[PDB]
Amino acid sequence: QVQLVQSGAEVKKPGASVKVSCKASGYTFTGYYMHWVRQAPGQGLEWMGWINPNSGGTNYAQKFQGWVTMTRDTSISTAYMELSRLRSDDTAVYYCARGGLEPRSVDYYYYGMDVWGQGTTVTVSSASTKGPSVFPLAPSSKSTSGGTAALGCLVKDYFPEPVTVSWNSGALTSGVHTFPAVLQSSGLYSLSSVVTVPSSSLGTQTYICNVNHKPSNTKVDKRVEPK
Amino acid sequence: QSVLTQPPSVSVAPGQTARITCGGNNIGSKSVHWNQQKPGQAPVLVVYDDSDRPSGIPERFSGSNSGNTATLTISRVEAGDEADYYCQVWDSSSDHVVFGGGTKLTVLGQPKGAPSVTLFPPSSEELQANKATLVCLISDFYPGAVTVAWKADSSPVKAGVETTTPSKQSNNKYAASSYLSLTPEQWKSHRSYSCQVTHEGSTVEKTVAPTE
Numbered sequence: 001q002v003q004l005v006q007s008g009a010e011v012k013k014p015g016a017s018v019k020v021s022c023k024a025s026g027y028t029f030t031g032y033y034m035h036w037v038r039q040a041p042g043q044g045l046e047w048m049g050w051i052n053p054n055s056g057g058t059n060y061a062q063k064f065q066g067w068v069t070m071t072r073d074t075s076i077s078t079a080y081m082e083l084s085r086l087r088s089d090d091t092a093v094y095y096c097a098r099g100g101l102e103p104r105s106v107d108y109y110y111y112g113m114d115v116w117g118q119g120t121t122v123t124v125s126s127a128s129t130k131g132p133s134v135f136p137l138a139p140s141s142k143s144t145s146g147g148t149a150a151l152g153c154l155v156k157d158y159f160p161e162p163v164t165v166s167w168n169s170g171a172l173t174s175g176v177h178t179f180p181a182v183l184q185s186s187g188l189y190s191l192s193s194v195v196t197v198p199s200s201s202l203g204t205q206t207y208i209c210n211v212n213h214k215p216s217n218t219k220v221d222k223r224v225e226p227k
Numbered sequence: 228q229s230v231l232t233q234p235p236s237v238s239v240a241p242g243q244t245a246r247i248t249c250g251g252n253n254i255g256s257k258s259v260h261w262n263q264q265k266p267g268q269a270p271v272l273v274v275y276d277d278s279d280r281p282s283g284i285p286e287r288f289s290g291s292n293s294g295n296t297a298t299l300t301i302s303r304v305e306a307g308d309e310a311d312y313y314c315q316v317w318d319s320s321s322d323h324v325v326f327g328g329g330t331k332l333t334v335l336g337q338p339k340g341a342p343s344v345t346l347f348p349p350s351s352e353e354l355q356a357n358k359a360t361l362v363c364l365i366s367d368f369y370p371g372a373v374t375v376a377w378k379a380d381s382s383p384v385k386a387g388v389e390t391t392t393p394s395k396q397s398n399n400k401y402a403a404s405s406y407l408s409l410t411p412e413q414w415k416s417h418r419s420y421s422c423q424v425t426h427e428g429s430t431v432e433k434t435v436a437p438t439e
Contacts, residue, residue, distance in 0.1 A: 044326060044328045045262070050322070095269060113324075116269040116270055118269055156360060177364075179403075184406075194345065
């Protein structure tokens with residue numbers, strides 16, 4: 001059961017640093033090179049370098065020299081990668097991946113990158129943490145078509161991602177469409193969650209969207225009522 | 228050094244054979260490995276040493292490597308093969324792994340569909356906080372390309388618009404959304420506002436009005 005398990009998502013200001021980790025299990029950590037590969041959003045894989053977990057020796061692609069430091073702790077079979085002085089265009093998912101078998105030996109076999117960690121998102125933004133303003137999207141005659149009514153919640157101007165929305169504490173799940181967030185030019189996000197329900201059921205049933213923004217320690221239950 | 232050149236997109240009908248090329252100078256002399264990356268996931272090694280498969284990978288995935296072109300070949304293409312495919316070599320001048328730029332495989336034949344559009348006006352709660360946002364939700368369209376334009380009383384509004392890129396829904400159609408920010412005075416001073424969605428040459432337009 002060969003696994004690489006990376007540490008959790010990180011959100012940073014330009015100029016800051018971050019240290020991400022990659023815990024290996026199910027094989028002999030010191031017997032394989034560890035690589036790191038990043039992927040900026042919507043873009044291709046970019047190899048960063050490798051570390052030899054047996055010696056600690058490293059090798060960095062050119063554009064990662066001088067601000068990337070790969071280390072390891074063999075005690076706990078863990079590789080680390082420290083990124084120094086982040087720029088906004090370092091925003092990316094950062095992967096560790098196990099590489100060539102038996103470093104510096106007659107049996108050296110690089111057959112690709114056969115096992116990948118799950119990735120660590122690193123978001124670099126000058127925006128500052130901020131909980132959302134949650135507003136009802138009231139069902140009206142204009143939000144109704146053919147006896148079903150659409151109502152929802154606007155989750156406005158928050159940072160960073162993610163936010164989760166449920167409805168009526170998890171009891172209302174059919175008809176729920178939570179849209180992916182827009183990143184506005186202010187650097188803050190907005191998203192909406194909408195639910196289609198029987199227009200005869202408004203008046204008898206209460207609708208509450210439950211918004212959780214864990215990065216700001218904020219939760220909002222917003223009642224959504226007809227006009 | 229080894230600069231690996233892949234076509235950005237390849238499309239193929241179900242059951243057919245997809246070929247994704249990876250071009251490089253004397254790539255034939257290096258061992259080429261191929262990773263598959265499905266939306267949302269970490270990459271997966273699908274072919275190594277030009278033609279071998281890791282255990283678990285179906286036999287429909289094969290590759291060749293000769294001269295100046297390596298080729299990932301996917302036989303009997305299923306819709307579950309939609310993914311980004313990357314080739315990879317190891318440069319000998321500097322123990323440096325080089326990736327190709329990636330190839331998007333789109334599997335053809337999914338049914339087209341015009342967008343459904345729902346437009347909400349500013350809530351009274353927001354207006355009472357001295358702000359106003361119009362929300363235009365766009366769903367169930369395919370293919371996943373759309374253009375969004377906003378009007379106040381039929382003249383075009385270009386400031387204050389924020390629109391997502393489309394993204395796949397669980398039913399394999401796409402969704403997007405667009406937001407128009409304005410002041411409560413701007414919202415009340417016009418007779419109507421419109422969100423107008425263009426998809427494959429045809430438009431769906433929804434209107435809201437402050438006094439409604």
